[PDB]
Design a protein around this ligand. Structure first.
Ligand SMILES: Nc1ncnc2c1ncn2[C@@H]1O[C@H](COP(=O)(O)OC(=O)CCCC[C@@H]2SC[C@@H]3NC(=O)N[C@@H]32)[C@@H](O)[C@H]1O
Ligand SMILES: Nc1ncnc2c1ncn2[C@@H]1O[C@H](COP(=O)(O)OC(=O)CCCC[C@@H]2SC[C@@H]3NC(=O)N[C@@H]32)[C@@H](O)[C@H]1O
Lengths: 235, 235
């Protein structure tokens, strides 16, 4: 009854009033490619590592099952499809989101969305969390806060799914295309701090062909980040 | 993202752009009670005796998985929950649907919806096909044809699900209450005929405490019909 017009992403949608985690459900259940798992609320939503992702009613919490028959080296770009998709959807609602490497979307430096990609077996799970009308943690933001009014959650869903389907189908054909859309919508040319053991700072110059964040340290040394947390305003 | 607020029916919803049959999928798959299976269109929709049920995109084609904890005697009444639910939803849209015992809803005697219940043991599948914006076969009608304009399919879905959840919840507590709702909404006081070998005709007077159709033959004889493979028609 939704009448979705997408080719793959959205072929099937499994909606839950409540769930532990759409990503977890997607990983442990046999689902065909393109199936979307979405829930009004998540009780065990999660980000990277052991981080909880607040998922109260009002937001858009979903996961998409993908089976990318592309080289293994390109698989790390799936996160970007999710981030760009969000950026495009926000633009449709007159919101300017900017990507924060490697999986976040910010509006005036406030996190409005996060992406989490996991690969159980040869099946890839693209998880996306976007704040729409829900309450958010301090420092974060939502579409409702940015627009000052309730936004039809289903409208955001249709919009995001439409963008993701187009981005995914193109990615399967022209896998390097997503990098340039990321570069044009990512926060660059600024000093950032890369946390974790062996923490360092430098200018986030760009992302390379593997999607690695290229950092120029003050010494001139160039480092390529594959994973980790980026901090824009750390002081 | 649908924000359904029902207690049982609609706790989960699996949406299909296309499916063979929501009833077949619902009967075959391992699904929790209350799960709704809905599709834009069915390639193999069916009614009783595997009769073809036209299911083009534009109509409401769905099945609900149920595991009613009530006496075996009451199970045959589940079909009535579907019929009454449809009638109530049509009334909300100002369409006067009337029940044709025991599984169809008519508007000015044209079929606008059909109900099909299938169940093996504890698992019961309640299937409902309702013509909304789709083209229909001869002898049928649709919400769009009755109202004169495209009808929001999602609104019809939300309405039907809300009604079905309430009716089902009450059925679990008082399995007999559904019979009164059927009586007040079914076509009675007119002549009908039971076709085939041993055929007979008479006035459809009412339904008894077992949901049987009470027919008074011209001779005054009273017959109680139990729905099965019997084909009944209005004269
Ligand atoms: N609702 C929210 N909005 C903005 N920031 C939040 C937030 N909830 C938590 N945070 C913060 O963001 C951090 C998490 O950041 P990370 O970069 O590691 O992790 C992420 O940014 C990924 C989040 C992925 C969420 C989706 S929801 C659908 C699917 N099902 C799941 O279980 N997960 C995915 C936390 O440590 C918090 O400080
Ligand atoms: N779209 C339509 N609208 C009105 N009448 C139709 C129709 N398509 C076929 N018919 C006629 O209705 C008769 C079927 O009547 P019956 O009384 O036996 O059977 C019914 O009235 C039950 C129909 C149940 C349909 C739903 S759709 C969701 C679920 N998935 C399925 O595969 N089935 C269920 C056919 O023999 C046709 O003459």
């Amino acid at each position: 009854m939704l009448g979705l017009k997408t080719s793959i992403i959205g072929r099937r949608v499994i909606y839950f009033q409540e769930i532990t985690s759409t990503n977890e459900f997607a990983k442990t259940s046999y689902l065909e490619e393109g199936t979307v798992i979405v829930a009004d609320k998540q009780t065990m939503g999660h980000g990277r590592l052991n981080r909880k992702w607040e998922s109260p009613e009002g937001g858009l919490w979903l996961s998409i099952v993908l089976s990318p028959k592309v080289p293994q080296k390109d698989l790390p770009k799936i996160v970007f499809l999710g981030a760009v998709g969000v950026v495009e959807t926000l633009k449709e609602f007159s919101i300017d989101g900017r990507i924060k490497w490697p999986n976040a979307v910010l509006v005036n430096y406030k996190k409005i969305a996060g992406v989490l990609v996991e690969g159980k077996g040869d099946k890839i799970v693209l998880g996306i969390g976007l704040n729409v009308n829900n309450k958010v943690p301090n420092g974060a933001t939502s579409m409702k806060l940015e627009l000052g009014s309730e936004v039809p959650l289903l409208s955001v869903f249709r919009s995001l799914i439409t963008n993701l389907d187009r981005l995914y189908l193109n990615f399967l054909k022209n896998p390097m295309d997503i990098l340039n859309l990321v570069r044009d919508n990512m926060i660059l040319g600024v000093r950032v701090k890369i946390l974790g053991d062996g923490s360092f700072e430098g200018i986030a110059e760009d992302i390379d062909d593997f999607g690695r964040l290229i950092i120029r340290l003050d010494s001139g040394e160039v480092k390529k980040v594959i994973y980790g947390d980026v901090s824009l305003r750390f002081l």
